[PDB]
Coordinates of C-alpha atoms and ligand atoms in Angstrom, one line a residue:
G1 CA -59.9 71.7 24.4
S2 CA -60.2 68.6 26.5
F3 CA -62.4 66.0 24.6
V4 CA -65.0 67.1 27.2
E5 CA -64.8 70.7 25.8
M6 CA -65.6 69.1 22.3
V7 CA -68.6 66.9 23.4
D8 CA -71.8 68.3 21.9
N9 CA -70.0 70.9 19.7
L10 CA -72.4 70.2 16.7
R11 CA -75.9 71.4 15.9
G12 CA -78.3 71.4 12.9
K13 CA -81.9 71.1 11.5
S14 CA -83.0 67.6 10.4
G15 CA -81.9 66.8 6.8
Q16 CA -79.9 70.0 6.5
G17 CA -76.4 69.0 7.6
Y18 CA -74.5 69.3 10.9
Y19 CA -72.4 72.4 11.8
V20 CA -69.6 73.4 14.1
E21 CA -68.9 77.0 15.3
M22 CA -65.6 78.3 13.8
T23 CA -63.8 81.7 13.9
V24 CA -62.1 83.3 11.0
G25 CA -59.9 86.4 11.0
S26 CA -58.6 88.9 13.5
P27 CA -60.6 90.0 15.5
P28 CA -62.4 86.6 15.3
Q29 CA -65.5 86.5 13.2
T30 CA -67.8 83.7 14.5
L31 CA -69.6 81.5 11.9
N32 CA -71.4 78.2 11.9
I33 CA -69.9 75.7 9.4
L34 CA -71.2 72.5 7.9
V35 CA -69.0 69.5 8.6
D36 CA -68.6 67.8 5.2
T37 CA -66.5 64.5 5.0
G38 CA -67.6 64.5 1.3
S39 CA -65.5 67.4 0.0
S40 CA -62.2 69.1 0.6
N41 CA -62.7 72.9 0.4
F42 CA -63.1 75.3 3.4
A43 CA -65.5 78.0 2.2
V44 CA -67.5 80.7 4.0
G45 CA -70.3 83.2 2.9
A46 CA -68.5 86.5 2.3
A47 CA -71.1 88.8 0.8
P48 CA -74.8 89.4 1.5
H49 CA -77.3 86.7 0.6
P50 CA -81.1 86.3 1.2
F51 CA -80.6 83.4 3.7
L52 CA -77.6 84.9 5.6
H53 CA -77.5 87.6 8.2
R54 CA -73.7 87.3 8.9
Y55 CA -70.8 86.5 6.7
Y56 CA -67.0 86.7 6.4
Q57 CA -65.9 90.3 6.1
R58 CA -62.4 90.0 4.7
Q59 CA -61.7 93.8 5.0
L60 CA -62.4 93.7 8.8
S61 CA -59.8 91.0 9.5
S62 CA -56.2 92.3 10.1
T63 CA -54.7 88.8 9.3
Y64 CA -56.3 88.3 6.0
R65 CA -54.2 87.8 2.8
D66 CA -55.4 87.7 -0.8
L67 CA -54.4 84.7 -2.9
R68 CA -55.7 86.5 -6.1
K69 CA -57.3 83.4 -7.4
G70 CA -60.9 82.4 -8.1
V71 CA -62.5 79.0 -7.4
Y72 CA -65.7 77.4 -8.4
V73 CA -67.2 74.3 -6.6
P74 CA -70.3 72.4 -7.7
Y75 CA -71.9 69.8 -5.4
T76 CA -74.9 67.6 -6.1
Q77 CA -77.4 70.4 -6.6
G78 CA -75.8 73.5 -5.0
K79 CA -72.8 75.5 -6.2
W80 CA -70.7 78.5 -5.2
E81 CA -68.0 80.9 -6.5
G82 CA -65.2 82.3 -4.4
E83 CA -62.0 84.1 -4.2
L84 CA -59.2 82.4 -2.3
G85 CA -57.1 83.7 0.6
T86 CA -55.8 82.6 4.0
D87 CA -56.7 83.8 7.5
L88 CA -56.4 82.5 11.1
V89 CA -59.0 79.8 11.9
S90 CA -60.1 78.4 15.2
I91 CA -62.7 76.0 16.5
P92 CA -63.8 77.5 19.8
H93 CA -65.3 74.3 21.1
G94 CA -62.4 72.4 19.7
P95 CA -58.7 72.1 20.4
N96 CA -57.1 75.2 21.7
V97 CA -55.0 76.1 18.7
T98 CA -55.2 78.7 15.8
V99 CA -54.0 78.0 12.3
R100 CA -53.5 79.8 9.1
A101 CA -55.7 78.1 6.5
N102 CA -57.0 78.5 3.0
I103 CA -60.5 80.1 2.9
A104 CA -62.7 80.4 -0.1
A105 CA -64.7 83.7 0.4
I106 CA -68.0 82.9 -1.4
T107 CA -69.2 85.9 -3.5
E108 CA -71.9 84.2 -5.5
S109 CA -73.9 81.0 -5.1
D110 CA -76.8 79.0 -6.4
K111 CA -78.9 76.7 -4.2
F112 CA -75.9 76.4 -1.8
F113 CA -77.3 78.1 1.3
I114 CA -80.4 76.6 2.8
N115 CA -83.2 78.7 4.3
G116 CA -83.1 78.0 8.1
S117 CA -79.8 76.0 8.1
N118 CA -78.2 78.4 10.4
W119 CA -74.9 77.7 8.7
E120 CA -72.8 80.2 6.7
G121 CA -70.1 77.9 5.3
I122 CA -68.7 74.4 4.7
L123 CA -65.7 72.5 6.1
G124 CA -64.4 70.0 3.5
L125 CA -62.6 67.4 5.7
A126 CA -61.6 65.0 2.9
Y127 CA -58.2 64.8 1.3
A128 CA -56.2 67.1 -0.9
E129 CA -56.8 65.0 -4.0
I130 CA -60.3 66.3 -4.7
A131 CA -59.7 70.0 -3.5
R132 CA -60.5 72.7 -6.0
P133 CA -59.2 74.2 -8.1
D134 CA -56.5 71.4 -7.7
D135 CA -54.7 69.4 -5.0
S136 CA -52.1 72.0 -4.3
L137 CA -54.8 73.8 -2.2
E138 CA -54.1 72.5 1.3
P139 CA -57.4 71.5 3.0
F140 CA -58.1 72.7 6.5
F141 CA -57.4 69.5 8.4
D142 CA -54.1 69.1 6.6
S143 CA -53.0 72.6 7.8
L144 CA -54.3 72.0 11.3
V145 CA -52.2 68.8 11.7
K146 CA -49.2 70.4 9.9
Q147 CA -49.2 73.5 12.0
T148 CA -49.9 72.1 15.5
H149 CA -49.5 69.0 17.6
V150 CA -53.0 67.6 16.9
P151 CA -53.1 63.8 16.0
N152 CA -54.0 63.2 12.4
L153 CA -57.5 61.9 13.4
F154 CA -61.1 63.1 14.0
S155 CA -64.3 61.5 15.2
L156 CA -68.1 62.2 14.4
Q157 CA -71.1 61.4 16.6
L158 CA -74.1 62.6 14.7
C159 CA -77.4 62.4 16.8
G160 CA -81.2 62.9 16.7
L161 CA -88.1 70.8 11.2
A162 CA -86.5 69.3 14.3
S163 CA -83.1 70.2 15.8
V164 CA -80.0 67.9 15.8
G165 CA -76.9 67.7 18.2
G166 CA -73.7 65.7 18.2
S167 CA -69.9 66.0 18.5
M168 CA -66.8 66.4 16.3
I169 CA -63.8 65.2 18.4
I170 CA -60.7 66.7 16.8
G171 CA -57.6 64.7 17.5
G172 CA -58.9 61.6 19.2
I173 CA -61.5 59.2 20.4
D174 CA -63.9 59.9 23.3
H175 CA -65.0 56.5 24.8
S176 CA -68.0 58.2 26.4
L177 CA -69.4 58.5 22.8
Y178 CA -69.7 54.8 22.2
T179 CA -70.5 51.4 23.5
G180 CA -69.2 48.0 22.7
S181 CA -66.2 47.5 20.3
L182 CA -64.8 49.7 17.5
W183 CA -64.5 48.0 14.1
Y184 CA -62.1 49.5 11.4
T185 CA -62.5 49.2 7.7
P186 CA -59.5 50.4 5.5
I187 CA -59.5 53.6 3.6
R188 CA -59.1 52.3 0.1
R189 CA -57.6 55.5 -1.4
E190 CA -57.2 58.9 0.2
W191 CA -59.5 61.1 -1.9
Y192 CA -63.0 60.7 -0.6
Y193 CA -63.1 58.6 2.5
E194 CA -63.5 55.6 0.2
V195 CA -64.4 52.2 1.7
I196 CA -65.3 48.8 0.3
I197 CA -68.7 47.1 1.0
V198 CA -68.4 43.3 0.5
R199 CA -72.1 42.3 1.2
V200 CA -75.5 43.7 1.7
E201 CA -78.5 42.2 3.5
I202 CA -82.0 43.4 4.0
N203 CA -83.7 41.6 6.9
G204 CA -80.9 39.0 6.9
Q205 CA -81.6 38.1 3.2
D206 CA -78.5 38.6 1.0
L207 CA -79.1 40.8 -2.0
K208 CA -76.8 38.4 -3.9
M209 CA -75.2 40.8 -6.4
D210 CA -71.6 40.8 -7.7
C211 CA -70.0 42.6 -4.8
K212 CA -68.5 45.1 -7.4
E213 CA -72.1 46.5 -7.9
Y214 CA -72.0 47.8 -4.3
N215 CA -69.0 49.9 -4.9
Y216 CA -69.8 51.0 -8.4
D217 CA -68.1 53.5 -9.0
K218 CA -67.2 53.8 -5.4
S219 CA -68.3 53.7 -1.7
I220 CA -67.8 56.6 0.7
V221 CA -68.6 58.0 4.2
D222 CA -70.2 61.5 3.6
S223 CA -71.5 63.6 6.5
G224 CA -72.4 66.2 3.9
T225 CA -75.2 64.1 2.3
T226 CA -78.4 63.4 4.2
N227 CA -79.5 60.1 2.5
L228 CA -78.0 56.7 2.2
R229 CA -77.5 56.8 -1.6
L230 CA -77.2 53.6 -3.6
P231 CA -76.0 52.9 -7.2
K232 CA -79.1 52.4 -9.5
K233 CA -79.0 48.6 -9.6
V234 CA -78.5 48.2 -5.8
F235 CA -81.2 50.8 -5.2
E236 CA -83.8 48.8 -7.3
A237 CA -82.9 45.5 -5.6
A238 CA -83.1 47.2 -2.2
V239 CA -86.5 49.0 -2.7
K240 CA -87.9 45.7 -4.1
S241 CA -86.9 44.0 -0.9
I242 CA -88.0 46.8 1.4
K243 CA -91.4 47.0 -0.5
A244 CA -91.8 43.2 0.0
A245 CA -91.4 43.3 3.8
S246 CA -93.5 46.5 4.3
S247 CA -96.1 45.2 1.8
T248 CA -99.0 45.4 4.4
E249 CA -98.7 49.1 3.4
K250 CA -99.2 50.3 -0.1
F251 CA -97.4 53.6 -0.6
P252 CA -97.6 55.9 -3.7
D253 CA -94.5 55.8 -6.0
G254 CA -93.6 59.3 -4.9
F255 CA -92.8 57.9 -1.4
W256 CA -90.2 55.4 -2.8
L257 CA -88.8 58.3 -4.8
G258 CA -88.2 60.2 -1.6
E259 CA -90.5 63.0 -2.9
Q260 CA -93.6 62.3 -0.5
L261 CA -94.3 61.7 3.2
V262 CA -96.4 58.8 4.6
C263 CA -98.2 59.1 8.0
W264 CA -99.6 57.0 10.8
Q265 CA -101.7 58.3 13.8
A266 CA -99.5 59.8 16.6
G267 CA -97.2 57.2 18.1
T268 CA -98.7 54.2 16.2
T269 CA -96.0 53.7 13.3
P270 CA -95.6 50.0 12.6
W271 CA -91.8 49.9 12.8
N272 CA -91.7 46.1 12.8
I273 CA -92.8 45.9 9.1
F274 CA -89.8 47.8 7.9
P275 CA -86.6 45.7 7.7
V276 CA -83.1 46.3 9.2
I277 CA -80.4 46.9 6.5
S278 CA -76.9 45.4 7.0
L279 CA -73.8 46.7 5.2
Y280 CA -70.8 44.5 5.4
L281 CA -67.5 46.4 5.3
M282 CA -64.1 45.0 4.4
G283 CA -62.1 44.3 7.7
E284 CA -58.5 45.1 8.3
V285 CA -57.8 41.4 8.1
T286 CA -58.0 39.9 4.6
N287 CA -61.2 37.7 4.2
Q288 CA -62.7 39.4 7.4
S289 CA -65.6 41.9 7.3
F290 CA -68.0 43.3 9.9
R291 CA -71.5 44.7 9.5
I292 CA -73.2 47.9 10.4
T293 CA -76.9 47.4 10.9
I294 CA -79.4 50.2 10.1
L295 CA -82.9 50.6 11.6
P296 CA -85.8 52.0 9.6
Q297 CA -85.8 54.8 12.3
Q298 CA -82.5 55.9 10.5
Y299 CA -83.8 55.6 7.0
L300 CA -87.4 56.7 7.6
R301 CA -87.1 60.4 8.4
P302 CA -89.5 62.4 10.6
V303 CA -91.0 65.5 8.9
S304 CA -102.7 67.1 12.4
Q305 CA -102.4 64.2 14.9
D306 CA -100.0 62.3 12.6
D307 CA -96.3 61.1 12.6
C308 CA -95.0 61.5 9.0
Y309 CA -92.0 60.2 7.3
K310 CA -89.7 60.7 4.3
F311 CA -87.8 57.7 2.7
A312 CA -84.2 58.7 3.1
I313 CA -82.6 56.2 0.6
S314 CA -82.2 57.3 -2.9
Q315 CA -80.7 56.3 -6.2
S316 CA -77.1 57.2 -7.1
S317 CA -75.0 57.3 -10.3
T318 CA -71.9 58.2 -8.4
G319 CA -71.7 55.1 -6.2
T320 CA -72.7 54.3 -2.6
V321 CA -72.9 57.4 -0.4
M322 CA -73.2 56.6 3.3
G323 CA -74.8 59.9 4.4
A324 CA -76.1 61.2 7.7
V325 CA -78.9 58.6 7.6
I326 CA -76.2 55.9 8.1
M327 CA -73.8 57.9 10.3
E328 CA -76.5 58.8 12.9
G329 CA -76.3 55.2 14.1
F330 CA -72.7 55.4 15.0
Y331 CA -69.7 56.9 16.5
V332 CA -67.5 57.1 13.3
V333 CA -63.6 57.4 13.6
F334 CA -61.9 59.0 10.6
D335 CA -58.5 57.6 11.6
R336 CA -56.4 59.3 8.9
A337 CA -53.1 58.4 10.6
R338 CA -53.8 54.7 10.1
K339 CA -55.8 54.9 6.8
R340 CA -58.8 53.4 8.5
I341 CA -62.5 54.3 9.4
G342 CA -63.9 52.9 12.7
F343 CA -67.5 52.3 13.5
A344 CA -69.0 51.7 16.9
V345 CA -72.6 51.9 18.2
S346 CA -73.3 55.5 19.3
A347 CA -74.0 56.5 22.9
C348 CA -76.8 58.5 21.4
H349 CA -79.0 55.3 21.0
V350 CA -81.7 56.2 18.4
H351 CA -83.3 52.9 19.3
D352 CA -86.2 50.6 18.4
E353 CA -88.4 48.6 20.8
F354 CA -87.2 45.1 19.7
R355 CA -84.2 45.9 17.4
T356 CA -81.1 48.1 17.7
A357 CA -78.5 49.7 15.5
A358 CA -75.4 47.5 15.6
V359 CA -71.7 47.1 14.7
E360 CA -70.9 43.4 14.6
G361 CA -68.1 41.0 13.5
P362 CA -66.0 39.2 12.3
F363 CA -67.7 37.6 9.4
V364 CA -65.3 35.4 7.4
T365 CA -65.5 34.7 3.6
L366 CA -63.3 35.3 0.4
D367 CA -62.0 38.1 -2.0
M368 CA -62.9 41.7 -1.1
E369 CA -60.2 43.7 -3.1
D370 CA -62.2 42.0 -5.9
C371 CA -65.1 44.2 -4.6
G372 CA -63.4 47.5 -5.7
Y373 CA -64.1 49.1 -8.9
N374 CA -61.4 51.1 -10.8
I375 CA -62.6 54.3 -12.2
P376 CA -61.9 54.8 -16.0
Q377 CA -58.8 57.1 -16.2
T378 CA -59.6 60.3 -18.2
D379 CA -57.0 62.1 -20.3
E380 CA -57.6 65.3 -18.4
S381 CA -56.6 63.6 -15.1
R382 CA -53.8 61.6 -16.5
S383 CA -52.2 64.8 -17.9
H384 CA -52.0 67.1 -14.9
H385 CA -48.5 66.8 -13.3
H386 CA -48.2 66.4 -9.5
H387 CA -44.9 68.0 -8.3
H388 CA -46.2 67.7 -4.7
Ligands
LIG1 C1 -76.0 67.1 -1.1 C2 -74.7 67.7 -1.4 O1 -74.4 68.2 -2.4 N1 -73.8 67.6 -0.4 C3 -72.4 68.1 -0.4 C4 -72.2 69.2 0.7 C5 -73.3 70.2 0.6 C6 -74.3 70.3 1.5 C7 -75.4 71.2 1.4 F1 -76.3 71.3 2.4 C8 -75.5 72.0 0.3 C9 -74.5 71.9 -0.7 F2 -74.5 72.7 -1.8 C10 -73.4 71.0 -0.6 C11 -71.4 66.9 -0.3 O2 -70.0 67.5 -0.4 C12 -71.6 66.0 -1.5 N2 -70.6 65.1 -1.7 C13 -70.4 64.2 -2.9 C14 -70.1 65.3 -4.0 C15 -70.9 65.5 -5.2 C16 -70.5 66.4 -6.1 C17 -69.3 67.1 -6.0 C18 -68.5 67.0 -4.8 N3 -67.3 67.6 -4.7 C19 -67.1 68.9 -4.8 C20 -65.7 69.0 -4.5 C21 -65.2 67.8 -4.2 N4 -66.2 66.9 -4.3 C22 -68.9 66.0 -3.9 C23 -69.3 63.2 -2.8 C24 -69.2 62.2 -4.0 C25 -70.5 61.4 -4.2 C26 -71.7 62.3 -4.1 C27 -71.7 63.5 -3.1
LIG2 ZN1 -69.4 79.1 21.2
LIG3 ZN1 -70.3 85.5 -10.8
LIG4 ZN1 -44.4 68.9 -14.7
LIG5 ZN1 -51.0 67.7 -7.6

């Protein structure tokens, strides 16, 4: 488990999430597992399903122990039901350590598994706070760090229907995965990997919104979501501005809805008419920020003699979700030990002829804590005690 043994340990199909090979149980059962920075539960298929041809067989594992507890987890469209337990977990193209972790054995599901995905489970790498059924269910990464000598840090280089590749570096930073300098934004609160966006530009033009609209009701880094998602108001401003630059082409509304492809003749796509998008993230120094710059090659997704494209930016009512669309630009450091997220330009350069994906700063201004929104506290959340 040198960083070199972890290089290129990810695979997937385009728009269907990235997965790492894990083993579960004794003897080890090999399974492919979606890497989700947007959730906190480790769960694996554990009974027959249409789209699966292997699953976790609890009864074949000598190290399995029943927790006698059910759990239910909805996501944006998919959901599953599970029965909790613990077993030995390893990442074979990862560090050379085995840990006892919590596993949700999935017994029923709806629209969870995706035909052709090649994944049989989901690794929630976010914090205990949002774990189901409550935060006393230690997440995998927590266990791994608690039980071994692995630094409290991981890094994602997501690259590339068509196949994708990439790397999850568990426990450090591999400099062969990036070029230029690494910029860190703070983790605002440890639940999701919540960050603050202080400014947005499309083709250098500021959208000029109250900076709180950008993080309404939050902003996060989610390897589990394909698209860049944007709060309704920001989405509308953004589309207006993208439509205006690309206006030599007149697409049907369904395209802007992300529900329809548009096509040019093989190798003739007019990239230049689509604008770069810059997201300015709060720096570690007060009044400083730095931008990540997104190419239309990242947000226009490839799907006769024709190159065809899906619009990978969609509306949100649950804040700004920086999905795979965004991450594919970058080597992203989830530096849990220092409560920061780093970005650098990826050594998998998914690059334009005149423009490039960029991580740039500092930019200096005023009043970024002012850009956070505070979610309305519900009675249900206020009432649960936390003797942890
Ligand atoms: C598209 C999708 O849904 N992706 C799953 C991962 C995923 C990928 C996939 F390919 C199929 C799936 F069903 C789920 C990912 O977590 C979604 N993450 C958010 C989400 C949304 C709703 C519930 C939960 N959540 C549950 C527990 C803790 N948080 C998380 C995080 C907050 C903002 C919106 C997306
Ligand atoms: Zn392998
Ligand atoms: Zn059921
Ligand atoms: Zn109490
Ligand atoms: Zn608690």
